[PDB]
Structure 1
């Protein structure tokens, strides 16, 4: 029986081997509370702590399972998918319903979560998210509904596998480079570059973007309209901010599809970076990491076409 480590970052999602005695029939389960906060307050600090831990105790066990809140689970998963160097399955799991309500999704999610982490096939596929009998990759997965237990879907490329009765039928694996193939190492960092997001919409104010420049942010991510477009005010503010070193990334408020390279905006003339299929939140995770390597817009783009 495999040894599996459950790393908690918050409250319990089930009720732990007491809560779900079935866990004992699939693996040797050990657990440790790494931190305790709501996911809406997730930060650089916790992020760095988790990747560090995973990298540290990586040889001490056969796989990890991370309980996390759902609010920003898509952010954390992507950051780990980029920064973890361990070659053992790292699986994230949460619950849409409180462990004390009727029909709590937590226990079964957990069990499937463990099952996934403990399957030899689950290795080498990146940081994984297991929700609603589905295995999802940390890159494409995202929360598509506010309350539904089925909210987590890889909206662009789809799931990796499905789980029935503790058996998984994998029929896909991600192509973009992840984990041990990324040049990203935070083992040595204590803080990450400052990157923020601004939203576009009709009559968009420039203050938010201006306020970010004046605080000297390293990076700004634009959640544009349509295929990455920006409202006049935001555009001007960002283009000058792209000439004073601030790395500017064009992404989109639209939940599926890519923000293509020089199509709607002449990225070249201004030095903007197109996020591709990464939503504002994810594009932010990648800008942050790239800004610990280079500061060259032409080099950040190449990063966005690879990871």
Structure 2
């Protein structure tokens, strides 16, 4: 009997993991500049763990991530599923938590899909991307990684696509699942999994994007003292399918913003109350009578995460009670 390594596919999309600057010590750099091959070759030990094949999907900063790249990824994973044992997606850190949740809801492939990035560019002293990529390959290769939904692997930690968020602007340790914690820790190329997400993911969702050319239009508005209603009115004037509110506290809205969203909701715009507060649920049965206005409470989904779910909810239904039920199940 001979040892055979898993086949792992790296789908590259850009990010600081592929960024470069002209000094190892200066902070200035440009994103999404280095190709997949360079990234693979910067981690010689990948041969110890897997047979790795790189595909460049796009090469962008994830600040410019968009619906089309999401659709491209989910269809590619779902199409290529039987050709490989696992997927790693190199990606910018800025919107990784959004892509990860989109994929967590739309991937039907039953093989691990692991996202990874780097907070320091590839050119920098003590660059994090090499060891991150190695650890993402470890996770994508591990049989025990299956059936946990789509994953993010950063700073020696396996995180679920739903709860994972970027907590700090610069720290290599930025990614945390701030409400429910990580799924497992990685040491010496091995994972001790102690948790799995309970919310329904991947092949247990009704979201099927195989045939979609676009996603429903959903925007985000912020609340704060003396908040203008102009952002909200602009989305309503443009025929937006949905609006997510980054509320204050427990999903609360500045009155002007409330009035514009209450009206929009009456016309059939889906409105989700979320919170600019970085941890904790936007609950039902607090200061906003959601049933009355036809609003939906986002639970622990932050505004960018709630947008993902809301867009996907809007592909199945425009009924707010059914959208609320979706927000309670996925």
Same fold (TM > 0.5): yes
SS where residue 34 of structure 1 aligns?
strand
Structure-2 residue corresponding to 1:181: 204
Q: Is the Cα–Cα contact under 8 Å of residues 16 and 118 in structure 2 kept in the other structure?
A: no
Structure-2 residue corresponding to 1:11: 15
Q: Is the Cα–Cα contact under 8 Å of residues 4 and 62 in structure 1 kept in the other structure?
A: yes
Q: Is the Cα–Cα contact under 8 Å of residues 16 and 117 in structure 2 kept in the other structure?
A: no
Q: Is the Cα–Cα contact under 8 Å of residues 108 and 202 in structure 2 kept in the other structure?
A: yes
Cα gap change, 1:206 to 1:293, in 2 (>3 Å) = same
1:252 to 268, 275, 279: 275
Give 1:36 deviation, angstroms. Answer: 1.3
Q: Is the Cα–Cα contact under 8 Å of residues 262 and 268 in structure 1 kept in the other structure?
A: no
Q: Take 2:53 and 2:78, find their aligned partners in 1: how far apart are those partners?
A: 17
Q: Is the Cα–Cα contact under 8 Å of residues 17 and 24 in structure 1 kept in the other structure?
A: no
Any stretches of 5+ residues in structure 1 without a counterpart?
none
Deviation readout 1:212-265 (Å, 9 max, x if unpaired): 101000100000000000000000000011000000000000000000012120
Cα gap change, 1:17 to 1:44, in 2 (>3 Å) = closer
Q: Take 2:266 and 2:134, find their aligned partners in 1: how far apart are those partners?
A: 51
Q: Take 1:103 and 1:187, find their aligned partners in 2: how far apart are those partners?
A: 40
User: Within 5 A, what are the aligned runs for 1:208-227?
Assistant: 208-227=231-250
Structure-2 residue corresponding to 1:295: 318
Q: Which runs of 4+ in 1 moved over 6 A?
A: none
Give 1:17 deviation, angstroms. Answer: 3.5
Q: Is the Cα–Cα contact under 8 Å of residues 89 and 123 in structure 1 kept in the other structure?
A: yes
User: Within 5 A, what are the aligned runs for 1:1-307?
Assistant: 1-10=5-14, 13=17, 16-307=39-330
Give the TM-score normalised by structure 1: 0.99
Q: Give the root-mean-square deviation of aligned CA atoms.
A: 0.8
Cα gap change, 1:218 to 1:137, in 2 (>3 Å) = same
Give 1:12 deviation, angstroms. Answer: 7.4
Q: Take 1:16 and 1:143, find their aligned partners in 2: how far apart are those partners?
A: 23
Q: Is the Cα–Cα contact under 8 Å of residues 294 and 320 in structure 2 kept in the other structure?
A: yes
Give 1:19 deviation, angstroms. Answer: 1.4
Q: Is the Cα–Cα contact under 8 Å of residues 90 and 127 in structure 1 kept in the other structure?
A: yes
Give 1:105 deviation, angstroms. Answer: 0.4
Give 1:18 deviation, angstroms. Answer: 2.2
Deviation readout 1:52-87 (Å, 9 max, x if unpaired): 100000000000000000000000000000000000
Deviation readout 1:273-298 (Å, 9 max, x if unpaired): 00000000000000000000000001
SS where residue 4 of structure 1 aligns?
strand
> Number of matched residues?
306
Give the TM-score normalised by structure 2: 0.92
Q: Take 2:96 and 2:197, find their aligned partners in 1: how far apart are those partners?
A: 18
Q: Is the Cα–Cα contact under 8 Å of residues 16 and 119 in structure 2 kept in the other structure?
A: no
Give 1:11 deviation, angstroms. Answer: 5.3
Deviation readout 1:112-139 (Å, 9 max, x if unpaired): 0000000000000000000000000000
